[PDB]
From Swiss-Prot, chains A, B:
It comes from Homo sapiens (Human). Glycans are attached at residues 50, 132. The chain holds residues 31 to 291 of 354 of the full protein. This is Carbonic anhydrase 12. Reversible hydration of carbon dioxide. Its cofactor is Zn(2+). Changing residue 91 to Q: In HYCHL; severe decrease of activity in the presence of physiological NaCl concentrations; no effect on localization to cell membrane.
Length: 261, 261
């Protein structure tokens, strides 16, 4: 099934997943002509993000990314419903081209991108249910640039060699997920878009923080070399690299900014 | 059949046109990391480009772009085969976001892009036969930016009002097509890629000139506003805008440059 390279790659997803050829698709390039300040974009509140170090949370290689399952007592507030967390995961490039963010800024890729997925729990029982309904999902995106070593991201990356292959699972002790977010979270871009992976449901309220975080070259190299899209016993192994979608046409959307300059 | 917007937009091209989901797809981002000087990239010569002003050439709005039909005695000298001209056309954005080149440079769109399409007339009888064959096509691409008024581009643009709607046609008196090319045409990027429109055949030798040309603000606005994709008697007219493909992944490959400096 679907991949980021070859016959089953992104230009072919719409063959099996119609919404991937529909409107309101993500990611997009964030550039001046389509930005507009909106003073009503007040600061989000991150509730229940400080996960207990004595509890443990499931990390899974699902064949397309590495994902950490999050508890439903973790929420974002500030939105017009409460949105409950369900999972976070990453997108990245490869060792010879560490430029695999999904969203771009003024045409430039960052090294990687973190997505923290939430669903409207006011309205829906689980994320799977919410995924194909209006205002079902809210995703927070953190842009990641090559920089200093990041001990908070390492709480995830230290477990990659235990989830190298599709289907494998590991437990990560709790930590404060807010440490994965950048400086000045009150500054963000906001827009209506989609899942960036099949089935590309146009049901996501996106928040992309303005400021990136840093992880080191060695942490990116671990992330880019540790994982496979395939099962441990697959005789045609495929490295999990370059797992980002190209940016999409705007189709008349604006992107709203909580910052005026 | 296909479009640049809505259900039949670029992510769905591969359903009817499988090569749109295959290898070697264009356009691409031209950035320093993938550039490599190649001394074999000598200057092309543009032969037969000074079209007799006693002859006339058909301008058509075909619902995807505006195209001028060119005579086969017009050709590129300097490639291994002679490539004969078939037609030129443009790609552009829209007045709210006037950055609709196909190729990008260091992640940045230019305002528009002109393509002069040629086919291998040494090997093949016409452009339609060549389009799906080895060594079949060669495209010259000129990046366009806003700046001073360009009389030569006005030799085309002054006729746009007569090809407002799909299916309409105007005659253009011969002028020197070389006037549409930028300064220092010896400076270019070269790579093997594809058509940027269905059927997306991977049979194009691209030459993208390093230096852009200029057209005025008013010229660019005319191109963006003069044309519709729809027939005149269509009860739901659509503006012809944003008629460019998003950039494609281009991994483990180089773009060769005729310049180092
Ligand atoms: C909502 C859910 C269906 C859980 C989802 C999954 C993915 C992956 C994990 C397949 C990458 C990617 C996304 S995305 N990149 O946030 O649109 C969302
Ligand atoms: C539809 C239109 C925009 C006019 C177009 C036509 C062609 C053909 C006819 C050579 C295939 C080629 C291209 S392109 N952008 O040079 O690959 C574009
Ligand atoms: Zn994601
Ligand atoms: Zn073209």
């Amino acid at each position: 099934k679907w991949t980021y390279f070859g016959p089953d790659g992104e230009n072919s997803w719409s063959k099996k997943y119609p919404s991937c050829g529909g409107l309101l698709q993500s990611p997009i390039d964030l550039h001046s002509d389509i930005l507009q300040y909106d003073a009503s974009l007040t600061p989000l509140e991150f509730q229940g993000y400080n996960l207990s170090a004595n509890k443990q949370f499931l990390l899974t290689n699902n064949g397309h990314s590495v994902k950490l399952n999050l508890p439903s007592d973790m929420h974002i507030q500030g939105l017009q419903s409460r949105y409950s967390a369900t999972q976070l995961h990453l997108h990245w490039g490869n060792p010879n081209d560490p430029h695999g963010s999904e969203h771009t800024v003024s045409g430039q890729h960052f090294a990687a991108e973190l997505h923290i997925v939430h669903y409207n729990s006011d309205l829906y029982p689980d994320a799977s249910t919410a995924s194909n309904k209006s205002e079902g999902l809210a995703v927070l995106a953190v842009l990641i640039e090559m920089g200093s070593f990041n001990p908070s991201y390492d709480k995830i990356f230290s477990h990659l060699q235990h989830v190298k292959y599709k289907g494998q699972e590991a437990f990560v002790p709790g930590f404060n997920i807010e440490e994965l977010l950048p400086e000045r979270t009150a500054e963000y871009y906001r827009y209506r878009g989609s899942l960036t992976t099949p089935p590309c449901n146009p049901t996501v309220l996106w928040t992309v923080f303005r400021n990136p975080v840093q992880i080191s070259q060695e942490q990116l190299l671990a992330l880019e070399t540790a994982l496979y899209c395939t099962h441990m016993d697959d005789p045609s192994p495929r490295e999990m690299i370059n797992n980002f979608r190209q940016v999409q046409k705007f189709d008349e959307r604006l992107v709203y900014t909580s910052f005026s300059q």
